[PDB]
Design an enzyme around this catalytic site. Structure first.
Site, PDB file in Angstrom:
ATOM      1  N   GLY A  58      35.693   7.032  52.568  1.00 18.39           N
ATOM      2  CA  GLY A  58      34.093   7.372  52.904  1.00 18.39           C
ATOM      3  C   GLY A  58      33.214   8.173  52.362  1.00 18.39           C
ATOM      4  O   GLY A  58      32.025   8.295  52.783  1.00 18.39           O
ATOM      5  N   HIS A 103      30.496  -1.598  45.411  1.00 17.89           N
ATOM      6  CA  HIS A 103      31.729  -1.955  46.183  1.00 17.89           C
ATOM      7  C   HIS A 103      31.457  -2.070  47.917  1.00 17.89           C
ATOM      8  O   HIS A 103      32.526  -2.288  48.408  1.00 17.89           O
ATOM      9  CB  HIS A 103      33.110  -1.242  45.872  1.00 17.89           C
ATOM     10  CG  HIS A 103      33.068   0.002  46.125  1.00 17.89           C
ATOM     11  ND1 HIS A 103      33.002   0.968  45.231  1.00 17.89           N
ATOM     12  CD2 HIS A 103      33.375   0.621  47.434  1.00 17.89           C
ATOM     13  CE1 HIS A 103      33.277   2.118  45.813  1.00 17.89           C
ATOM     14  NE2 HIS A 103      33.535   2.174  47.063  1.00 17.89           N
ATOM     15  N   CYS A 109      32.456   7.991  49.304  1.00 17.29           N
ATOM     16  CA  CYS A 109      32.151   7.219  47.988  1.00 17.29           C
ATOM     17  C   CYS A 109      30.255   7.126  48.323  1.00 17.29           C
ATOM     18  O   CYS A 109      29.919   6.913  49.512  1.00 17.29           O
ATOM     19  CB  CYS A 109      32.489   5.710  48.183  1.00 17.29           C
ATOM     20  SG  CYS A 109      34.313   5.570  48.230  1.00 17.29           S
TER      21      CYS A 109
HETATM   22  O1  LIG Z   1      39.119   4.816  46.321  1.00 17.37           O
HETATM   23  C1  LIG Z   1      38.395   4.657  47.320  1.00 17.37           C
HETATM   24  C2  LIG Z   1      37.926   3.109  47.543  1.00 17.37           C
HETATM   25  C3  LIG Z   1      38.103   2.405  46.260  1.00 17.37           C
HETATM   26  C4  LIG Z   1      39.269   1.514  45.805  1.00 17.37           C
HETATM   27  C5  LIG Z   1      39.372   1.048  44.805  1.00 17.37           C
HETATM   28  C6  LIG Z   1      38.342   0.733  43.857  1.00 17.37           C
HETATM   29  C7  LIG Z   1      37.142   1.525  44.240  1.00 17.37           C
HETATM   30 CL1  LIG Z   1      35.522   1.216  43.349  1.00 17.37          CL
HETATM   31  C8  LIG Z   1      36.937   2.175  45.289  1.00 17.37           C
HETATM   32  N1  LIG Z   1      37.832   5.396  48.232  1.00 17.37           N
HETATM   33  C9  LIG Z   1      38.068   6.766  48.116  1.00 17.37           C
HETATM   34  C10 LIG Z   1      37.227   8.045  47.424  1.00 17.37           C
HETATM   35  N2  LIG Z   1      37.672   9.154  47.326  1.00 17.37           N
HETATM   36  C11 LIG Z   1      38.685   9.566  48.143  1.00 17.37           C
HETATM   37  C12 LIG Z   1      39.450   8.747  48.671  1.00 17.37           C
HETATM   38  C13 LIG Z   1      40.665   9.349  49.576  1.00 17.37           C
HETATM   39  C14 LIG Z   1      41.204   8.518  50.237  1.00 17.37           C
HETATM   40  C15 LIG Z   1      41.090   6.966  50.371  1.00 17.37           C
HETATM   41  C16 LIG Z   1      39.925   6.617  49.791  1.00 17.37           C
HETATM   42  C17 LIG Z   1      39.325   7.462  48.872  1.00 17.37           C
END
Ligand SMILES: O=C(Cc1cccc(Cl)c1)Nc1cncc2ccccc12
Ligand SMILES: O=C(Cc1cccc(Cl)c1)Nc1cncc2ccccc12
Lengths: 306, 306
Positions: free
Chosen positions: A143, A41, A145
């Site tokens: 971030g 993504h 990820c």
């Molecule tokens: O959730 C995401 C992005 C996302 C959204 C939907 C689908 C997919 Cl695959 C990825 N990022 C985050 C990963 N960890 C912790 C987070 C804490 C706060 C904000 C985002 C955070």
């Protein structure tokens, strides 16, 4: 003596983390040999995440659209492909700090260390367990990820987890290093439900053995029980059922403490029915299930790595 | 979101650990530049530990009596001296992996990461706090002596702790990197008493702010209190008294949550008097004091290091 939630040393993994940028999106990647692995993504904008068509999105990207930085060393992308939910960015320079590594898909109840990263740079390390519902209860911000989970087996780093998303419920979901999600989740911004979470019983028992090793013996019962009678009590309290394979795994801990597995189960049964009554075990007022039998043996015997 | 007991990445410290052997005794040393630091009781036999005369013992040792191994690279000892309770083994080869480092003496209530080592090789990493009675509640086996505690400030490793001994009570005592013990302990096998252990109140408050950041708000009170009235309740329950410097440190957390420090203290006062009543905060059934205000800001904002 003593007992701590102990992570693996992270040095071998720190030298593999890079930042990956595609357009506006920047996240972490894992640089092993001449391939960089990262969540697919990264090719999405904030609007694409509601219903992304990853094949169509990837078609509009070419090798020079991806920006991989390893500190102040920029890597050049020479090929790209999509394996399930991960992107594989083939680059020109092989990582000189590539450890002996392996890709593994762990089973629920197993534990691993997480190296939380932002912009390709390590922030901290902690230990956690794969829950029975295939989520993890982590500590992740936007971030993070592409941060990875791993174990160390002597000289070999076993990568088992790549972080992808936080669910609306605040827990975390990700994939193995081949891009297959743990659990029924998809990399899309939509409401998704994780199953009922249960307690990893074999881990709780391992932790009680650790408590006995460390001088905490008040919960030791004068009773015994049967595997069937225990499982009937455990399932009432949302505990994983105990099998014979679990009894076999706990054998070494039984021999070191002289307490049979079934006698330990009887003590656990009483703890489930009467609570802990304001007492504590190994410093905790709750039953802990994030220590596997191997974790306990490792910490209480002093296993080291290269 | 989420909150974990998170350690610093240990890569910079792993490349500094070596094993030191003097006669029969082998423990860990810290190799920075061309000096190896290690606990001075490496020159003792098991019989000497009951009442050691370190000056007389060190006189009977010469440079070639010490065996320093850095993996399969043997270092040659060219000089040796005793600084307080640490031995400084000057060697011929400077460590090529020496990070930018600093020696620091922390204050009680501060936290740091421990890299537990055996025979010069890392075993695991965990986070802990210096207790008010200058002990630490660690996880250490025989031969872990010389393992170090540290923080990371951007690119600089701040070494603050070297492990020396386990007390008969099961807790751990050690020195700074100049060889001065934390607390009233001596490196001798005799019964030694640590003072009364108290709870680090400013840390508990920081953790409650972390809980609010993560959506746990049930303990928020409709009352307020005074600094004097709170300190009168805290000292009954063996809590460290709160000072104005503590209020000043918590300022950023107050601004991010919109909850004044004194209002948070009122919530803590009620928790102390009525308990937690079977509930949990950030997954724990006890009040946690091993997170400093800076730890909370670091984890909830995503600070990284080189
Ligand atoms: O959730 C995401 C992005 C996302 C959204 C939907 C689908 C997919 Cl695959 C990825 N990022 C985050 C990963 N960890 C912790 C987070 C804490 C706060 C904000 C985002 C955070
Ligand atoms: O306590 C010592 C040696 C010692 C004795 C007396 C005085 C001094 Cl200065 C040092 N080693 C250990 C340090 N940590 C943990 C241990 C766990 C089990 C056994 C020994 C352990």
């Amino acid at each position: 003596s003593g007992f701590r939630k102990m992570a693996f040393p992270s040095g071998k993994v720190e030298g593999c983390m890079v930042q990956v940028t595609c357009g506006t999106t920047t996240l972490n990647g894992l640089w092993l040999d001449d391939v960089v692995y990262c969540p697919r993504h990264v090719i999405c904008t904030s609007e694409d995440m509601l219903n992304p068509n990853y094949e169509d999105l990837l078609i509009r990207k070419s090798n020079h659209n991806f920006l991989v930085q390893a500190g102040n060393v920029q890597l050049r992308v020479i090929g790209h492909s999509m394996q399930n939910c991960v992107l594989k960015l083939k680059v020109d320079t092989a990582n000189p700090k590539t450890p002996k590594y392996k890709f593994v898909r762990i089973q629920p109840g197993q534990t691993f260390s997480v190296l939380a990263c932002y912009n390709g740079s390590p922030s901290g390390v902690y230990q956690c367990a794969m829950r029975p519902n295939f989520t993890i209860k982590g500590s992740f911000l936007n971030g993070s990820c592409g941060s990875v989970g791993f174990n160390i087996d002597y000289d070999c780093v076993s990568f088992c987890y790549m972080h992808h998303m936080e669910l609306p419920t605040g827990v975390h979901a990700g994939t193995d290093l081949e891009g297959n999600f743990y659990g029924p989740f998809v990399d899309r911004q939509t409401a998704q439900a994780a199953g009922t979470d249960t307690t990893i019983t074999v881990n709780v028992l391992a932790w009680l053995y650790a408590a006995v090793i460390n001088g905490d013996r008040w919960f030791l019962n004068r009773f015994t029980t049967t595997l069937n009678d225990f499982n009937l009590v455990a399932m009432k309290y949302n505990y994983e059922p105990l099998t014979q394979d679990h009894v076999d795994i706990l054998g070494p801990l039984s021999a070191q403490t002289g307490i049979a597995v079934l006698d330990m189960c009887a003590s656990l049964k009483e703890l489930l029915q009467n609570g802990m009554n304001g007492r504590t075990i190994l410093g905790s007022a709750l039953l802990e299930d994030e220590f596997t039998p191997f974790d306990v043996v490792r910490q209480c015997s002093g296993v080291t790595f290269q």
